[PDB]
């Protein structure tokens, strides 16, 4: 199963070689017939357990509304925005359109029954099929990590029995393709471990680590943590290749450069290709691209973004300003008054085009000339609908009222009767963020980006991402701020028109979003929503409460049945019990090492500690950055780290069988068969919480071991017999 260590004598201290023989490749692959028979048997058992009773919850389940509805968005082609990279939603769109799905069903809210036009059981079959293949990848990953055959069989059956992966993979969720491609990344990298790192099999394993690793990174950004984990194991392996003296330096740089190329080139290539399929298939424009730039939207079909507006704007032109940084922007004023300050006409950001977004450019002092908007030309923004100027009296702000800066601006005045110096706005063109040419000097629509400074207060026109709830709902705030952010201060003009200009005027339109700017803008909205995704959710959890399996998340409640994600607790608590016991035993082997006693004698203990530093390090890199996030997160974010936890627990069962009971392996197989038997018992008792199959209430009360997990336990009937003589509602 595992060979003895091949250490050799260097010039200072002994060193370990890192070139496995072909015997190590033959011992840990499916070279026999009995092993292929047990992989086929585990594929039958897994394909029964992970795919039992499918389409019995025949309504939408937790976040199946999201990724199902987004799959519908990729089918219809109307653009949308989600926190995640496209591959494991566009992949459900390919499975859906492969199954005959034509949009036609907005996945609205949990409990909506599926019509018989949407293929969901085929999408559920894809999700639970990849959630079934990750079990067989855990077997093969474990055997490639160097593991007894039967203990990989019973640890991987113990993984097919794990409740949290049956729940998370059975439905239209994100962690099932994600977990398949993370499991294929550790699969292909542990296949790379056992090959002599120069042969063609090793580079095939690096390429499979590349496409699976970057196909995990392109499905959900926790795959980037698998890129980090693989990379830290590359620092491990390249460190021991430096430690090998029979390997030339050109060999170490060839493994390091090809390792770098297959393991950062191919993930970034596949990530960029999958975003190209994202941008190339999602071509229509809906309300999903409502907070994108108008050059982003210029690539989309059926636009309301204005094209061929008048470039050179003059004094006397009915114009419409648009805020640069905040996407929901227009200078907007309409006949509703403030609740605070001076209670005058309000100035807001309304993101859609109206006639109330219109403003005249008139001087402080309508002629027959075309006086251009030079840098420093003070103007008065005259709103043409409600007969008012733009006024910045020094009163209290509406909703950002706790502001020594950020002076409040309003709209009040009479044309010809009430025009004062406090309605002036000095146009100051920012010459850096404007594109060069004529637009850098004077104001060109869509091309320059100026800043309106108030001539009597010295403050600049300002807005940010805080709306107004009083009147004109879902409209942001216009202020007149000093020492506000220069990014949030930029304004530019679109949709301008004056009579003092011919009809043969050089128009201008947007530069429509080269693919790099499309990519970077889309990721700025990814990071912007992802950082600012704060909602009060009742099943929201805390990352230090994950490894103990308290207060799991709920999924579905209809017609006296429920679905609820709590993991296999006798596998969960043994995973994290082994995080504790392995931390304790590696501390006592450091202190027992340096204190004088010799550690790491037998090769099985060495490969145990090496592969549990590997797998424990996978637990560290997929769980510690979830502490470093100022956002909401649920129990299913622990679950990629819990895959490395059940790998390391696999090696724990291997060190129970293979080292501490070398003379009596019947007791090692006895410990593993009682652990597996208790695991399958925990699945069999908690099967009616996964599949949405009926319990009874007197056993649903008994099943709640911890009081922390709570899944509407009065939903069930008092007996299993009443479900047969029962009709079920459909929403």
């Amino acid at each position: 199963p595992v060979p003895e260590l091949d250490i050799k004598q260097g010039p200072v201290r002994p060193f370990i070689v890192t070139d496995p023989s072909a015997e190590l490749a033959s011992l840990r692959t499916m070279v026999t017939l009995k092993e292929k028979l047990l992989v086929a048997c585990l594929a039958v058992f897994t394909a029964v357990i992970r795919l039992h009773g499918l389409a019995w919850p025949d309504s939408v389940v937790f976040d199946e509304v999201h990724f199902g509805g987004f799959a519908s968005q990729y089918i219809r082609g109307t653009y949308f925005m989600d926190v995640h990279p496209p591959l494991a939603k566009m992949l459900y769109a390919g499975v859906a359109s492969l199954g005959g799905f034509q949009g036609d069903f907005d996945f609205e809210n949990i409990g909506d029954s599926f019509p018989s036009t949407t293929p969901y059981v085929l999408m559920r079959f894809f999700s639970a099929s990849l959630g079934a293949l990750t079990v067989i990848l855990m077997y093969m990953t474990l055997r490639y990590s160097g593991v007894r055959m039967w203990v990989a069989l019973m640890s991987a059956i113990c993984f097919a029995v794990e409740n949290s992966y049956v729940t998370i993979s059975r439905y239209i969720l994100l962690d099932a393709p994600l977990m398949f491609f993370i499991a294929a990344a550790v699969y292909s990298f542990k296949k790379y471990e056992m090959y002599p790192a120069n042969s063609l099999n090793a580079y095939k394993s690096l390429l499979a680590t590349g496409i699976a690793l970057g196909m995990a990174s392109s499905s959900k950004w926790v795959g980037l943590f698998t890129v980090t984990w693989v990379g830290l194991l590359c620092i491990w392996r390249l460190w021991f290749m430096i430690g090998d003296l029979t390997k030339s330096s050109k060999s170490i740089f060839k493994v390091a450069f090809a390792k770098l190329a297959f393991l950062l080139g191919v993930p970034f290539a596949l990530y960029l290709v999958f975003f190209y399929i994202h941008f190339q298939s999602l071509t229509l424009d809906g309300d999903g691209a409502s907070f994108f730039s108008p050059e982003f939207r210029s690539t989309l079909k059926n636009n309301k973004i204005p094209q061929n507006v008048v470039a050179d704007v003059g004094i006397g032109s009915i114009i419409s300003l648009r805020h640069l940084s905040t996407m929901g922007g227009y200078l907007h004023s309409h006949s509703h008054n403030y609740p605070a300050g001076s209670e005058q006409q309000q100035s807001t950001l309304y993101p859609h085009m109206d006639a109330n977004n219109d403003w005249l450019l008139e001087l402080y002092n309508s002629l027959t000339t075309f006086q251009n908007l030079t840098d420093g030309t003070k103007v008065r923004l005259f709103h043409t609908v409600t007969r008012c100027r733009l006024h910045s009296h020094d009163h209290k702000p509406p909703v950002s009222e706790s502001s020594d800066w950020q002076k409040e601006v309003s709209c009040y005045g009479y044309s010809g009767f009430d025009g004062d110096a406090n309605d002036d706005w000095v146009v100051e063109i920012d010459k850096k963020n404007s594109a060069p040419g004529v637009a850098q000097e004077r104001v060109i629509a869509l091309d320059t980006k100026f800043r309106l400074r108030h001539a009597m207060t010295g403050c600049y026109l300002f807005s940010h991402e805080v709306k107004l709830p009083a009147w004109g709902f879902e409209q942001q705030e216009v202020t007149c701020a000093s020492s506000g952010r220069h990014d949030l201060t930029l304004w530019y003009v679109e949709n301008n028109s004056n009579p003092l200009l011919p009809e043969d005027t050089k128009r201008i339109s947007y530069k429509p979003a080269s693919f790099i700017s499309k990519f970077i803008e889309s990721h700025k909205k990814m990071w912007h929503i992802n950082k600012n995704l704060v909602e009060p959710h009742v099943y929201e959890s805390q990352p230090t409460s994950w490894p103990f399996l308290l207060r799991g998340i709920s999924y579905w409640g209809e017609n006296n049945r429920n679905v609820y994600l709590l993991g296999n607790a006798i596998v969960w608590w043994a995973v994290t019990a082994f995080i504790g016991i392995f931390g304790l035993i590696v501390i006592t082997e450091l202190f027992s090492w340096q204190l004088g006693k010799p550690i790491l004698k037998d090769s099985k203990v060495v490969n145990f500690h090496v592969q549990v530093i590997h797998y424990l390090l996978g637990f560290a890199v997929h769980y510690a950055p979830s502490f470093l996030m100022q956002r909401q997160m649920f129990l299913h974010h622990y679950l990629p780290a819990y895959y490395f936890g059940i790998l390391a627990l696999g090696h724990a069962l291997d060190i129970i069988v293979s080292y501490v009971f070398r003379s009596k392996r019947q007791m090692g197989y006895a410990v593993v068969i009682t652990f597996l038997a208790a695991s399958v018992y925990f699945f069999k008792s908690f099967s009616p919480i996964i599949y949405g199959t009926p319990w009874t209430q007197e056993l649903c009360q008994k099943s709640q071991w911890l009081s922390g997990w709570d899944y509407n336990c009065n939903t069930y009937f008092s007996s299993l017999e009443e479900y047969k003589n029962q009709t079920l509602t459909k929403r």
Binding site: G243, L245, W405, G484, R485, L595
Partner: protein, 690 residues
């Protein structure tokens, strides 16, 4: 020999003399308050008036500004605004002379620092002219700051650190205990000047963990000697820097004893102890009926018991009872008798004192409702019920009976009865049996954004949320001394609370703030004062011969630990003799780790960071650059042309930081012109200097 002893004597007084010249040359020329002289000078003036204040930073810097003021013949009577001129009695020349004496002692301490970390003699001179001739240190050493003090106790921390390292070969000697206790004193002063002195203690702590680690493997060391090493390191590296820190808060609390601004960041008992005492009452404590009180929560975040005239939209349509944190007439409360008895009348003759363990009806004064929990649950926390106000002296139920329970007594009077400020009390309902608590969470805007009040059935008696105290008493006595350790904890929690409140919003452009990548490579500087042609105008940035070459030496050494570690794993024997390993480890490695600990928290944290935060981190970068001149030119000491090339390369770079300090000498020595004269040293954009 004799020439080396001659340079060893007459050379530290040349660098001390150029330190006193470099840091004190135009101290009294600016004649205006500057960058944070407005703040820390004011905080020094608080000690001279003995008035209490609250601030983020630990007090030994501000107590050394107070000691800087006591030596100037100054009584603290002038607050320090920003920008304004000085009064003629405030002799700021002694104060700026004091802080620039701390930087002018930071230079010779870097001389003997570099003498202690190996460093063949030209390296000690390049490192002393390198820490000396710098406009960042001499700019920010010029002023009433505690950046010079943080830099001074950082340099004394590293100096006493290496002087502790140099007697590891004869442990438990007189020199070993000497530099171990001086390392403890200097580390403790390093925290107590500013809370970012935990970085150098992370460095000395990593050295200590590495020492105890490698003392596990010594075969001759007995367990008694090794336990003596553990007690010696926790004493002189944990207890002594904590005893200096506690002594600094003992001089902080016991020195100033009046009231002042920022007094409201304390529990009300400590505010009642001090001399000002706008929260206390002399003759009587509390009674029945006539005692108009305002109930305050002793929880960290709780406030006064409030009852505004609006009613619940979600409840039993009774008056809202919430918690609000300012002075109001709606915060007034009093006590009334229990259910079944005749209530309070305004013409009573017996002034009844209140009895704990007895049910009462807590009645609001300005409105007239009874304190009550009703059978509608709390709006946010759906576990418990909701506290409301209902009825009058006769209208209500049996759930209006609220008992009073003694939780803690502070003595000096009768402990049996309820009192004001000396009786922490819980309130429990009689019929339901829930304890009156407060979660501290925020309500939606129906309750005007105030605190949530719950009545939990079974909380614990060790909970601070259920502890209420009487603060106001309305119709010969000294308040007891509070526990000093408790005041230490509450004041450090208030300091950390202001650190959490110091996080900027992304919408406001702080013109003065910077990011940590700008402090090396000098992308931005820092404008300390008003940029008119009247006053001489200063500007914070390092000399670009010292910190460009120094920053690229941290990048060149941070890829020298990696190269020597790869070559270590490749069985090369890199550092043969213990001398060059000593220079690598103490002169090179622990300044890379002290650079990283003094710099990487400023690139990780979400707080307003300025250019003056890099001054302790730049010092270890300059040690690293001194090492890259030391070991990088060690091989040239054997060839004659290599020796001459070595001395003209040391003299070339020393002449480079001389000429580049003198070329940028106006931005520390004053820039007295009209600010357009000094565009010649406006090398880059984002150096807003002209």
């Amino acid at each position: 020999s004799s020439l080396l002893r001659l340079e060893s004597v007459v050379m530290p007084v040349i660098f001390t003399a150029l330190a006193l010249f470099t840091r004190m040359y135009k101290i009294g020329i600016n004649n205006h308050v500057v960058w944070d002289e407005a703040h820390f000078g004011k905080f020094g003036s608080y000690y001279l008036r003995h008035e209490f204040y609250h601030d983020v930073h630990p007090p030994l810097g501000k107590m050394l500004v107070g000691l800087s003021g006591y030596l100037a013949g100054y009584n603290g009577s002038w607050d320090f605004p920003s920008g304004e001129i000085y009064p003629d009695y405030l002799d700021y020349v002694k104060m700026r002379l004091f802080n620039a004496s701390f930087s002018a002692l930071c230079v010779p301490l870097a001389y003997f620092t570099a003498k202690a970390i190996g460093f063949s003699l030209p390296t000690v001179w390049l490192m002393t002219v390198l820490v000396l001739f710098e406009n960042s240190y001499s700019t920010l050493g010029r002023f009433i700051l505690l950046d010079s003090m943080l830099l001074f106790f950082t340099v004394a921390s590293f100096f006493s650190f290496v002087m502790f390292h140099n007697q590891r070969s004869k442990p438990f000697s007189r020199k070993w205990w000497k530099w171990l206790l001086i390392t403890g004193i200097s580390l403790g002063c390093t925290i107590s000047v500013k809370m970012v002195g935990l970085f150098i203690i992370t460095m000395v702590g990593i050295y200590t963990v590495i020492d105890l680690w490698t003392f596990l493997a010594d075969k001759s060391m007995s367990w008694k000697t090794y336990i003596n090493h553990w007690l010696a390191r926790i004493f002189g590296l944990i207890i002594v820097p904590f005893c200096i820190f506690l002594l600094c808060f003992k001089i902080h609390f016991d020195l100033l004893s009046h009231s002042g601004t920022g007094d409201a960041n304390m529990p009300s008992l400590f505010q009642a102890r001090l001399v000002g005492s706008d929260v206390g009452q002399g003759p009587r404590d509390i009674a029945l009926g006539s005692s108009v009180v305002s109930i305050k929560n002793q929880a960290l975040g709780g406030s006064l018991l409030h009852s505004h005239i609006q009613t619940y939209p979600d409840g039993s349509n009774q008056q809202q009872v919430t918690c609000y944190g300012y002075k109001d007439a709606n915060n007034e409360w009093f006590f009334n008798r229990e259910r079944g008895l005749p209530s309070w009348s305004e013409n009573e003759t017996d002034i009844e004192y209140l009895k704990p363990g007895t049910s009462y009806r807590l009645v609001h004064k300005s409105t007239g409702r009874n304190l009550h929990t009703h059978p509608v649950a709390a709006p946010v926390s759906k576990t418990q019920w909701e506290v409301s106000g209902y009825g009058d002296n006769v209208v209500g139920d049996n759930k209006d009976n609220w008992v009073i329970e003694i939780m803690d007594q502070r003595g000096d009077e009768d402990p049996e009865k309820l009192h004001t400020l000396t009786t922490s009390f819980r309130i429990k309902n009689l019929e339901m049996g829930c304890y009156l608590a407060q979660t501290g969470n925020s309500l939606p805007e129906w309750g005007f954004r105030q605190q949530e009040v719950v009545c939990m059935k079974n909380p614990f008696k060790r909970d601070k949320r259920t502890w209420w105290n009487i603060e106001t008493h309305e119709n010969d006595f000294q308040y007891p001394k509070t526990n000093f350790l408790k005041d230490f904890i509450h004041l450090n929690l208030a300091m950390m609370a202001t650190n959490n409140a110091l996080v900027p919003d992304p919408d406001k452009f702080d013109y003065l703030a910077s990011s940590a990548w700008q402090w090396p490579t000098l992308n931005v500087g820092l404008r300390l004062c008003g940029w008119g042609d009247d006053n001489p105008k200063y500007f914070l940035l390092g000399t670009p011969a010292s910190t460009w070459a120094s920053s690229v030496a941290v990048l060149a050494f941070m890829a020298t630990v990696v190269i020597l570690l790869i070559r270590w794993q490749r069985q090369y024997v890199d550092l043969r003799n213990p001398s060059n390993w000593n220079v690598f480890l103490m002169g090179g490695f622990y300044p890379l780790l002290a650079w990283g600990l003094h710099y990487m928290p400023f690139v990780i944290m979400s707080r307003v960071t300025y250019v003056h935060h890099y001054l302790p981190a730049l010092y270890f970068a300059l040690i690293i650059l001194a090492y890259c001149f030391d070991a990088g030119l060690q091989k040239w000491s054997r060839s004659k042309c290599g020796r001459i090339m070595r001395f003209v390369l040391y003299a070339g770079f020393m002449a480079l930081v001389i000429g580049c300090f003198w070329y940028f000498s106006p931005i520390s020595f004053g820039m007295e012109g009209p600010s357009s004269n000094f565009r010649y040293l406006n090398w880059f954009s984002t150096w807003d200097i002209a």
